[PDB]
Amino acid sequence: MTWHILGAGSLGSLWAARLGRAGLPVRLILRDRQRLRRYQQAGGLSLVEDGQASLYPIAAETPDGGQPIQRLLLACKAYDAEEAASSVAHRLAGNAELLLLQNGLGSQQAVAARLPRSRCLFASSTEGAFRDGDFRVVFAGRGHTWLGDPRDTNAPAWLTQLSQAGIPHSWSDDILERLWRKLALNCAINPLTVLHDCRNGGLRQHPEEIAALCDELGQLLHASGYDAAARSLLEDVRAVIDATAANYSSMHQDVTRGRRTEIGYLLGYACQHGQRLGLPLPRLGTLLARLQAHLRQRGLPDR
């Protein structure tokens, strides 16, 4: 019944604002008591829509106290997901369901294995949101979220509550195919944007590099049972480049801001998966090696 929100991701606050303002029970799970004290001083969660700011006084708490968690939304970086879910594992009720809003792959399976008695649903979202302060989030762009569970493919009954809160979603009976579509899309664009220090539109000047990457990424999708994604991957990459030509990729923004990237769940996960299939991916291998060396050169982690 209650929507417990864990993680400091921008999407978690956007979900919490829409869920709470629609009359659904929502409870924020903040990091520590110091963070809870500052949230109470701010008075609630501030959402910015088209320049207009609104204050949503959602109830909040810390992982140690509170009621049993039956439904948890995990919205954090992929490298923080396992550590975050384990901080509230003592409050999971057995019938608990987890909605994992992490980019890439790897962290979802790690959380699912760490919490065997809980149901971990996978999510892939295109909604844009960024933080402008400790408890202030800007609704940057409308998007769509795909939900699914590889272990239990039947849709839950609470999906209609998301419709009431205006959260666009679709239940997919093969959520792994959706996550692989977006991961292969990330590997073809973001690594080159960091190495070349350019906007996504600048990748038009490297057509053969894009084609060779999608070639190996297409073989990786074919070897994993995702034929439809592999055939349209190249034109899908071309469409995203033209649609986001003036934008800097999310990984380009992470590096320029001196922060850790999610490479361990994007290009690093792809090359890892190709090795397990015995599928050689040399171009992605050197691309991964150049990206890791690029990160280490600036004191940033390479995983």
| Side chain identity at residue 274, one-letter code | G
**Residue 246 and residue 201 in contact, taking contact as beta carbons nearer than 8 Å:** yes
- Give a yes or no: residue 1 inside a domain: yes
Residues 132, 197, single domain; the answer is: no
Q: Please classify residue 214 by burial: count the beta carbons closer than 10 Å to its beta carbon, then call 0-12 exposed, 13-18 middle and 19+ buried.
A: buried
Residues 149, 255, single domain; the answer is: no
Q: How was this model experimentally determined?
A: X-ray
d(CA 191, CA 257): 16
Residues 6 or more apart whose CB falls under 8 angstroms from that of 36 comprise 30, 60, 61, 62
Residues 161, 198, single domain; the answer is: no
Per DSSP, what are the bridge partners of residue 110? none
Q: Please classify residue 69 by burial: count the beta carbons closer than 10 Å to its beta carbon, then call 0-12 exposed, 13-18 middle and 19+ buried.
A: buried
**Residue 48 and residue 139 in contact, taking contact as beta carbons nearer than 8 Å:** yes
d(CA 191, CA 252): 8
d(CA 264, CA 261): 8
Binding site listing for substrate: 103, 186, 190, 200, 250
- Please report, for the domain that includes residue 284, its CATH number: 1.10.1040.10
In the DSSP assignment, the letter for residue 155 is P
d(CA 301, CA 293): 10
Integer CA distances (angstroms), 42 to 19, 265, 276, in order: 20, 34, 49
Strands 145-148, 119-125: pairing kind: antiparallel
Catalytic: which of 182, 261, 263, 270?
182
Residues 145, 232, single domain; the answer is: no
**Lookup result for tokens 């500052």:** 38
**Residue 107 and residue 38 in contact, taking contact as beta carbons nearer than 8 Å:** no
d(CA 27, CA 32): 15
182 is catalytic: yes
Residues 272, 148, single domain; the answer is: no
Residues 128, 9, single domain; the answer is: yes
Q: Please classify residue 255 by burial: count the beta carbons closer than 10 Å to its beta carbon, then call 0-12 exposed, 13-18 middle and 19+ buried.
A: buried
Residues 6 or more apart whose CB falls under 8 angstroms from that of 88 comprise 4, 6, 29, 63, 69, 72
Binding site listing for NADP(+): 7-12, 35, 103, 129, 131, 262
- Give a yes or no: residue 104 inside a domain: yes
Binding site listing: 7-12, 35, 103, 129, 131, 186, 190, 200, 250, 262
- Give a yes or no: residue 160 inside a domain: yes
Which residue segment(s) compose the domain that 75 sits in?
1-173
